[PDB]
Amino acid sequence: EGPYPEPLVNLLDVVYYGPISIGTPPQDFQVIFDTGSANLWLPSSKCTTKYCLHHHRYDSSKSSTYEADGRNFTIVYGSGNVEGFISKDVCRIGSAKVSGQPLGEALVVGGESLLEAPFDGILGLAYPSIAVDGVVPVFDNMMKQGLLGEQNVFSVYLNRDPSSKEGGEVLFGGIDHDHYKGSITYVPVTAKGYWQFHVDGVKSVSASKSAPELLCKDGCEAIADTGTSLITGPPEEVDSLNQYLGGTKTEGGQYLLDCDKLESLPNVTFTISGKEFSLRSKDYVLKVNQQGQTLCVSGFMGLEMPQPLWILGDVFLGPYYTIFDRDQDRVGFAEVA
Amino acid sequence: XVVXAX
């Protein structure tokens, strides 16, 4: 039946993570809930690296419900990588008890974003078609076990104010109208892997510029990815968008904005299923501290994908409450409440 | 930030 509300912590508007347990008795972890990947993994007790010793580790030998598998697994992310071996155990999210859940026991991890993370691992919520080693994803296993009843969706709220107490929620098996206003706009999934769909256009129309900036001019593809902080796009288009906004880059992976000029920045709008989804500069500028300085990072970054697409990460998924619907293979967006 | 699987 359910539904199962999973509460999230918001670290600096860049990552969101929540509690799970594995095994019998429960071993507790924090994981990022990631609609851009399909695998669950945690650091192994068989790992004694600096990384593993400063995170929560899974010890199969203390779990009476553990079952061995032992296949090698390797996963590559935009911001890191992981390798280890597969095991299977009970996985709990709130009051949901997900039996026989494959997980990766991580032995080697790379990427600062993972190595210094406040979370222990990643719980993928993408389609099973992209699961490394073909192992059943958590949500798929919930559906197989009938834990959502007849409502095989999950809905994500991300708070974009890190000073606020409640970071966010993943609601398994429901849509909470107390997290949105108006009506949901749905878009059908195209390629089932990521939560991928067609976008009609992307634009910015400044009051201070003679011309608008019209991107994704002939339509484009996008994904909804809770595990991406910003919005990514085809580099050529993101370069131009940042030029229109006054973003500059001579190092790193992001464009920077003058922190004293943010109030003059125009909205940027994504048109999806014929409806406009606007982002104010308050929505798309991320405060970051690096190397002793406060920066204002443009929330539009370039990323070349195998087939060009835009990744709509937390910058978008905060102001728009998002419904991930596996009964109808569609994504819903509504203005957050 | 971060970009989650390729």
- Of A175, A198, A231, which residue constitutes the final position of a domain? A175
Give the E-state strand segments of A35-179 in sequence order: 40-43, 67-77, 80-93, 96-110, 121-124, 153-158, 168-172
A170 and A29 in a single domain? The answer is yes
In Å, what resolution does this model reach? 1.5
User: Distance between CA A135 and CA A116 in Å, rounded?
Assistant: 27
From which experimental method does this structure derive? X-ray
All residues of chain B having their beta carbon less than 8 Å from the beta carbon of residue A77 are 3-6
Cα distances (angstroms) measured from residue A59 to each of A3, A21, A25, A99, A150: 29, 12, 11, 17, 35
Query: Helix H segments across A192-271?
Result: 235-245
| Cβ burial, residue A21 (10 Å; 0-12/13-18/19+) | middle
User: Distance between CA A218 and CA A165 in Å, rounded?
Assistant: 41
Closest CA to A244 of A276, A206, A216: A206
Residue A137, domain CATH: 2.40.70.10
A147 and A236 in a single domain? The answer is no
A331 and A198 in a single domain? The answer is yes
Catalytic residue among A120, A140, A225, A314: A225
A261 and A327 in a single domain? The answer is yes
Helix (H) or strand (E) holding A138: helix A138-144
For residue A128, the enclosing domain spans: 1-175
A39 and A92 in a single domain? The answer is yes
A114 and A196 in a single domain? The answer is no
A219 and A275 in a single domain? The answer is yes
> What count of other Cβ atoms lies within 10 Å of the Cβ of residue A116?
9
Q: CB–CB of A135/A86 below 8 Å?
A: yes
All residues of chain A having their beta carbon less than 8 Å from the beta carbon of residue B5 are 36-39, 75-77, 124, 126, 130, 132
A59 as an active site residue: the answer is no
Residue of A nearest to B6 (CA): A77
Tokens for A193, please give them: 């892997």
A213 and A148 in a single domain? The answer is no
Helix (H) or strand (E) holding A115: helix A112-115
Q: CB–CB of A297/A254 below 8 Å?
A: yes
The CA-based diameter of chain B, rounded to the nearest angstrom, is: 16
All residues of chain B having their beta carbon less than 8 Å from the beta carbon of residue A39 are 5
| φ/ψ (deg, to 5) at A131 | -65, 125
